[PDB]
Amino acid sequence: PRFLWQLKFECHFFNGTERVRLLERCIYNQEESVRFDSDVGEYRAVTELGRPDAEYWNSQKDLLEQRRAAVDTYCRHNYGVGESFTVQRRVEPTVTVYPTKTQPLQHHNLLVCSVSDFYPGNIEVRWFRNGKEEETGIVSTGLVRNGDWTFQTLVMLETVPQSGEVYTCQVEHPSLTDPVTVEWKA
Amino acid sequence: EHVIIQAEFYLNPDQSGEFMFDFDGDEIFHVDMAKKETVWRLEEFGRFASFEAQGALANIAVDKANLEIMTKRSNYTPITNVAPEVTVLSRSPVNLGEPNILICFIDKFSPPVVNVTWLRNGRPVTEGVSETVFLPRDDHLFRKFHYLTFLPSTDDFYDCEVDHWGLEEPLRKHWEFE
């Protein structure tokens, strides 16, 4: 019979650090009770349980005044401390392509383009067959968060490898000044 | 459009307390209670930053109490377990004889208490394994990662056994070369 009390201090940034929203929220089991939204400037109750704290705290002026300023003393503060290794972290993606099925020419199988070991997550992937870009029937596994500040994705493509074809996976990512290409033939 | 989140949680009876920093989804660090110190997700971060750990311990304390307080005027409404979705992937594409890493994503669960085990050919693996404290998630549930280091082989096969109150029987996801 567990009881859980969460607490989250989040700083939201828009356009570098020109507009910032501090959000201090105290959560019960998984039910958020009270919160302080810099965009309001005072604690508000989200459910019944929080009302008490919503009052007791909104009464403490040294508290409110500290909270309202937290937007800089806290948010804009840490943002600038960890910017270099967080906001501007860049890791090039290593790309690998490989046929799913095992079948002689003329038989219809998946082509997988593994785009791994990259950060930020923001990335674009494209499929090419003999210079003509593919758009239809492209399945994507979506983006993966490896947990070690690294992303990964899989973009599959089905076809009927005919002799002489050249499938190429083209990737574009912030860590790259020029797209990375990987071909594959029959 | 980045976000920094000082996510902290405390839970009874377990008395497991956690304090951590999150950025755009990944953890920057957490404060090791026992060691009363700071633990960086990436050693590089350390050469880059610093954090006075003693102050984290404070918050958790208030948290522990804040809980006890809420745990009461809720009419002891207990936490409703949420089953964890489990999955397995390699950090990078696999080639025989090419050392790689198996990832086990334990995602979308609660409470932040769980039991994980890596299995190589049926047997539990003990060396070459690491993990992460309970990571927060926008939906207020938790995320957990585990890592096994291996050397792809045809005979070898693995399993990430996960247990959690929200399940009847432990969860067992499989993985093997191709």
């Binding site: 607490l7 201090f9 201090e24 105290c26 008490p52 704290d53 009052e55 007791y56 705290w57 403490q60 508290l63 937290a70 003393t73 806290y74 503060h77 840490n78 401390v81 960890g82 | 000082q6 304090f19 920093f21 880059f48 930053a49 610093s50 954090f51 006075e52 102050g55 984290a56 404070a58 918050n59 208030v62 948290d63 109490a65 804040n66 307080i69 809420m70 009461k72 005027r73």
Partner: peptide, 14 residues
């Protein structure tokens, strides 16, 4: 040389 923690208020006893 860095990171601050955002202190927190205490709950209303109940």
């Amino acid at each position: 040389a860095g990171f601050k923690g955002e202190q927190g208020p205490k709950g209303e006893p109940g």
